[PDB]
Amino acid sequence: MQKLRSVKEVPQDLTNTLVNIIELRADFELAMVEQYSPWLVNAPTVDSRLFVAKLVSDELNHGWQLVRLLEEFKVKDVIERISNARLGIHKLEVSNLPLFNWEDVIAFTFLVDGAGLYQLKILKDCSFEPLSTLASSMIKEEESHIFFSQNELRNYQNKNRMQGAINFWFPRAVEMLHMTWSLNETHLRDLNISDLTKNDLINGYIKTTNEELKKCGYNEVN
Amino acid sequence: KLRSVKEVPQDLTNTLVNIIELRADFELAMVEQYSPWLVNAPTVDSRLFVAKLVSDELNHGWQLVRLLEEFKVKDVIERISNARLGIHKLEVSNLPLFNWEDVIAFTFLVDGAGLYQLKILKDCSFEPLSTLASSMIKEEESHIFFSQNELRNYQNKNRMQGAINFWFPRAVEMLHMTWSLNETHLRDLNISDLTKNDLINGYIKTTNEELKKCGYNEVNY
């Protein structure tokens, strides 16, 4: 397919869907800044606190690189809405939930941030070059978040308390993946990202995640 | 020059531990003080800076705590780890930064005053602390540079002056908190400059000159 290097190369018909895709991703990552911030001080170990600092730094930098992409689209009201968004007025329900306990941080990183990586791997093939380049550079940082959470899962002592957190966040991660299904299918095909709304992504996410949970010593969520 | 804890005489150990503890507590308190501003700073560049400062202070603070592990002071390490707003050593470390002008004034004046002390600690006889103090100077100087730019660009100059007038005497008070340390022990550790009046007089003089160059009124203590 032919690439779209600039906003000038994007037809007016595609702008609203492309803006909404970038807005949704910017809001998701900036919400993580609020959700993970209490754990800079309260994470159980030194290495854990250092990781929370890295993730917060990564999501904040990712988030404002996405918002900087929107400046080229002349959508000042969308940018102001993203900037003023706080817990309770984020787009996704999963973005309006605080992470009160350490097992919520682990389960959220592994399952919700995990589900977001499945979407990011689709966006790396987007016809709009500024977004596909930005999505590709973010994958390595998100994979280190999953790797850390996988290690925290294996090392967690209260396996019953951890399972309870997995059982809470797993269906919410699945519901989050369904939130793209309202986007224009014709616009997604033109942007080469129609894989976002197919059932195969959700079935593949459930299958692989349940396989990883088993391998980490936890019960599958079905 | 003292390369390890084995090389440190017993009569300096308590003073050296207290110096490292005080610095570790100051920097970890900044994590709590600056954390609300990751989301609430007024601009994108401001939020990015708060992330960098939080990351810097958290990494240096826990590197300072790692030094105390060889001194056999597990109760001191546990006290530092459990410290939260209200039980930090310094009064200035128990004050939240409620408004953006408090963040600017705190960075420029309190973190500024801490850089004056850090420049003295870079010459400490105890090698693991002097090396650690030297590596943070560049990171702390970027915090001051940012706050100087935020000062110049601040629109409500009267509201900014109020924040300066509040934090300047508290930064001066903070510098006096080393005056309870053993003077003989500080000379032996080559850090006696910490308790000299020249440091406080030089800090007030330079800060007031720096304040005027940014378009603000001097503070007389």
Automatic annotation (TrEMBL), chain B:
Superkingdom of origin: Archaea
InterPro entries per the UniProt record, alphabetical: Aromatic_CoA_ox/epox (IPR052703), Ferritin-like (IPR012347), Ferritin-like_SF (IPR009078), PaaA_PaaC (IPR007814)
Gene Ontology annotations for the cellular component aspect, listed alphabetically: cytosol
Pfam family membership, one: PaaA_PaaC
GO terms classed as biological process: phenylacetate catabolic process
SUPFAM superfamilies named in the record: Ferritin-like
Protein name: Ring oxydation complex/ phenylacetic acid degradation related protein
Lineage: Archaea, Thermoproteota, Thermoprotei, Sulfolobales, Sulfolobaceae
